[PDB]
Amino acid sequence: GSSGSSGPVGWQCPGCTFINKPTRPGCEMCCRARPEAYQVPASYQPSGPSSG
Numbered sequence: 001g002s003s004g005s006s007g008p009v010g011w012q013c014p015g016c017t018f019i020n021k022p023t024r025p026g027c028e029m030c031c032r033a034r035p036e037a038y039q040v041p042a043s044y045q046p047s048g049p050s051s052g
């Protein structure tokens with residue numbers, strides 16, 4: 001495969017290669033379901049704001 005290809009986050013749509021957030025199991029462009037094969041880093045958050 002590719003040596004050191006971490007790149008940006010999110011799973012690249014297996015159809016439109018649309019780097020979709022690691023929290024969105026679906027696509028936005030071709031709304032093509034997320035490829036189960038892919039792997040998401042458990043214990044992940046949308047990085048929401050805090051401190052009111």
Ligand SMILES: [Zn+2]
Binds near residue numbers: 014015017030031
């Ligand atoms: Zn897509």
